[PDB]
Amino acid sequence: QTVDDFKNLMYKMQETRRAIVFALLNEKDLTKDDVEILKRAYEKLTDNFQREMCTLTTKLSVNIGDETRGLEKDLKYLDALMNIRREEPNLLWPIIMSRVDLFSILANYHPKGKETFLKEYEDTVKFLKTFISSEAITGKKPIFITDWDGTMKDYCSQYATNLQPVYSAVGMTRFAASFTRISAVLTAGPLRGPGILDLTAMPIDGPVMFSGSWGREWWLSGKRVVHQDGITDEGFNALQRLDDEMKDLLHTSPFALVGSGVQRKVDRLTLGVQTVCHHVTSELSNRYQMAVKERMHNSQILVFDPSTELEVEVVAHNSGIIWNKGNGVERLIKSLGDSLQSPGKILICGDTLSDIPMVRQAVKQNPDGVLAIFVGAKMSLREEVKQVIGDESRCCFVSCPDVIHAAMSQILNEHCIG
Ligand SMILES: [Mg+2]
C-alpha cells in the first residue's frame, strides 16, 4: 500500500514485461509465471476508486488509471495468445498474433464511441500502407520518427509509472524491424532511471532507437551518447550533483512520484512540486522547493524558475541554440549513415506542438515526401501540421495511440503473415 511497494511492484512487473516481449519476438516460450506476475499486479491495483499511497509523515492520492488499463489490455491480449499457443505449441508467434483480434480488445477502451475508432483505424491502415509502398518505390526502407507520450502511449498521471504495455511494444518492434530502415523515438524525459529505457517494454538495442532530453541523449548502439552543446562543462556536472542531493532526499518523507517526478535531463532538472487539482498539501510543496534551493548550493551557475503551478525547472544556461526535437532528429540521422533528404517517405507521429520542429525539419529536407499521424489534438494543432506541410492527404489525425497500434498490427498481419 506504500510508495516503495508501488514503485517496486510496477518496476519488477515492467522488467517482466520486457521478458515477455523478448519471448514474443524471439520465438521463445511464454512462462505462465510471468503472465501471473502481470495478473497479480493487476488484481492488487484493484482491491480496497483510484488508490492512495503513504510513507510515514505523508500520504498522497495517485491516479493509477493508465497503469491499470495497460495491465488489463495486456492480460486479455496475452490470454488470447496463450490459449491459441497451448496448441499448436510450435506455431510461430506472429501467426498466432494474426489470429488474435487486437482490434476488438482495444476498440472497447476510448472517448468517442466505437465507429469512430473503426474509421480512424481504417484510415490509419491506409496511410501506413502508403508509407510501406515507399519502400517498393525506392528500393530502400523508409524512416519512422515518433514522439512517445500521447503518441505511442496514453498519457499517465505520473512519469515514474508511465509504462508501455506488451501489445504495443510488440507491434511497434515488429513494424519498425520489418518496414523501416530507421526508427527513432523522441521523448522529453531522460534515458535511464526513471527515463524511457526503464519505462519501455521494448528491446532498446534493436530496430528502434530511443532518446530523451529532446534528442540531446540517445541510446546506441550499446552505450549512451550525449550532446551537451551548451556552455558549459560546469553545471552539467553540477546538474548531476544536484540530481544526486535529490536521490539523497527522496529517501526521506518526500514523494518522488508526482506529475513529472524529478527528471534529470541533459540541460536541466524538471520537477513536479504540485499536482492537479491540489494534492501535496501546499505547505509541504513549499518546504520541498526550498529543500531544492537548499541543495542548489559562488552562487552555483544554474538558475531556478517556477515554470508553472505544478512544475518547476532548474536550468543550466549558459548556454543554448535552443535545442528542439528537430535538432535531435537531425543529429541522429546525420550521426548514422543517413539523410531525410533521400527520396522516399518519412513518417512522423506526434501529439503536442513540440513535435512540429520535427515535421519542419522533415519537409525542409523532403517536401514530397513526408507523412504525419497526429494524436489527437485540437483544430489549432491539426491546422498547424496541415500548414507546415502541403496537403492534408499527407495528414492523418487519430484520437488515441491504440488506433495506430491496431493499424500497425493489421499491416503486420497482412504483409508479414499473408
Ligand atoms: Mg508529448
Based on the domain organization, do 310 and 329 belong to the same domain? no
Based on the domain organization, do 25 and 145 belong to the same domain? no
Resolution (A): 3.0
Q: Which among 74, 149, 267, 402 is annotated as catalytic?
A: 149
Q: State which approach was used to obtain the coordinates.
A: X-ray
33 is in an annotated binding site: no
Which residues span the domain enclosing 128? 114-231+321-418
Broken C–N links (> 2.5 Å) in the chain, after residues: 48, 253, 297
Based on the domain organization, do 15 and 138 belong to the same domain? no
DSSP assignment string, 49-116: ---EEE-SS-EEE---HHHHHHHHHHHHHHHHHHHHHSSSTTS-HHHHHHHS-HHHHHTTS-SS-HHH
Place of cell 489534438: 377
Last residue of a domain, one of 113, 147, 166: 113
Based on the domain organization, do 183 and 327 belong to the same domain? yes
The CA 72 to ligand 1 mean position distance, Å, reads: 23
DSSP assignment string, 157-212: SSSTT----HHHHHHHHHHHHHH-SEEEEE-SS-SSSSSHHHH--S-SSSSEEEEE
Based on the domain organization, do 273 and 336 belong to the same domain? no
The CA 254 to ligand 1 mean position distance, Å, reads: 27
264 is in an annotated binding site: yes
The CA 40 to ligand 1 mean position distance, Å, reads: 30
Based on the domain organization, do 26 and 75 belong to the same domain? yes
CATH number at residue 406: 3.40.50.1000
Distance CA 260, CA 212 (A): 14
Per the CB < 8 A criterion, the answer to whether 190 and 265 are in contact is yes
149 is in an annotated binding site: yes
Based on the domain organization, do 340 and 208 belong to the same domain? yes
Q: Say which amino acid occupies 16.
A: T
CATH number at residue 246: 3.30.70.3080
CATH number at residue 54: 1.20.58.1800
Q: Assign 396 to helix, strand or coil.
A: strand
At a CB cut-off of 8 Å and minimum separation 6, what does 150 contact?
Answer: 351, 352, 375, 401
Find, among 236, 233, 259, 255, the residue nearest to 246 by Cα.
255
The CA 182 to ligand 1 mean position distance, Å, reads: 20
Per the CB < 8 A criterion, the answer to whether 249 and 291 are in contact is yes
Last residue of a domain, one of 96, 113, 130: 113
Last residue of a domain, one of 113, 142, 165: 113
* Helix residue ranges per DSSP H, 181-324: 196-199, 234-250, 282-295
The CA 33 to ligand 1 mean position distance, Å, reads: 34
User: How many domains, the chain?
Assistant: 3
Distance CA 220, CA 229 (A): 19
The CA 25 to ligand 1 mean position distance, Å, reads: 27
Distance CA 392, CA 386 (A): 6
Note if 149 is an active site residue.
Answer: yes
